[PDB]
Amino acid sequence: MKTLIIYSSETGNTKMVCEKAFEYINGEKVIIPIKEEDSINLDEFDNIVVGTWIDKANANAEARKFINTLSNKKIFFIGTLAASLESEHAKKCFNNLTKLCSKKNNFVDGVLTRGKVSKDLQEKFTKFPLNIIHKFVPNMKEIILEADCHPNESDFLLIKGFIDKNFNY
Ligand code: HEM
Numbered sequence: 001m002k003t004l005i006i007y008s009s010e011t012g013n014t015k016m017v018c019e020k021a022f023e024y025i026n027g028e029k030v031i032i033p034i035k036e037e038d039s040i041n042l043d044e045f046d047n048i049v050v051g052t053w054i055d056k057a058n059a060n061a062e063a064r065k066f067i068n069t070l071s072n073k074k075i076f077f078i079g080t081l082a083a084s085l086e087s088e089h090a091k092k093c094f095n096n097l098t099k100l101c102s103k104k105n106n107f108v109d110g111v112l113t114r115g116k117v118s119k120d121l122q123e124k125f126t127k128f129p130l131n132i133i134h135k136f137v138p139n140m141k142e143i144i145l146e147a148d149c150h151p152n153e154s155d156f157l158l159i160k161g162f163i164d165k166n167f168n169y
């Protein structure tokens with residue numbers, strides 16, 4: 001059995017948790033960024049685990065496009081987002097990723113972990129249009145601040161549980 005972990009990451013959060021997933025998996029496995037897809041033959045992999053960061057409650061474009069090149073693959077996701085993992089927003093994100101993976105592939109499971117908001121985006125949040133767009137989103141300031149320390153051990157434990165559940169202990 002061969003497992004591929006293939007990910008998008010701009011500021012490293014998704015890469016970080018996907019690297020933990022790679023470490024925890026036993027047996028044959030490869031981890032690459034999506035940009036290096038040509039380094040492997042997708043046909044050789046029984047499990048495809050896609051790492052994605054949340055962009056407006058959905059998979060980031062690079063990861064969305066990659067998933068939409070796949071058909072009938074046994075597929076999983078590992079997502080990062082800045083919202084609280086207990087929030088309704090996170091549940092909406094999880095459902096959106098489930099819908100994306102299940103549409104044309106064979107979706108088994110996924111996990112969301114938390115990741116800090118980039119310095120650049122934290123600055124843009126104080127400017128038009130993001131400040132107006134999120135004006136009435138509750139707890140906006142604290143959500144961003146409480147994401148700053150993530151990913152951290154709490155997220156790695158979520159990854160460990162996800163790998164335990166789906167691949168091996
Ligand atoms: C460039 C970055 C972002 C953009 C362009 C963006 C865009 C939007 C837009 C347009 C909406 C209104 C709903 C819609 O029309 O789709 C929205 C709502 C919301 N955004 Fe963002 N957002 C960004 C970053 C973030 C981040 C970093 C967080 C969390 C830390 C966040 C959390 C939310 C929440 C909780 C809502 C309320 C609606 C919901 O629960 O989905 N957003 N955002």
Ligand SMILES: Cc1cc2nc3c(=O)[nH]c(=O)nc-3n(C[C@H](O)[C@H](O)[C@H](O)COP(=O)(O)O)c2cc1C
Pocket residue numbers: 008009010011012013014015053054055056057058080081082083114115116117118121
């Ligand atoms: C353009 C953009 C849109 C984002 N939209 C959301 C969002 O809708 N919900 C959320 O919780 N986090 C959102 N975030 C925060 C990222 O999902 C989070 O910081 C992620 O861990 C970054 O991953 P990376 O470091 O692998 O690039 C957004 C970030 C960016 C840059």
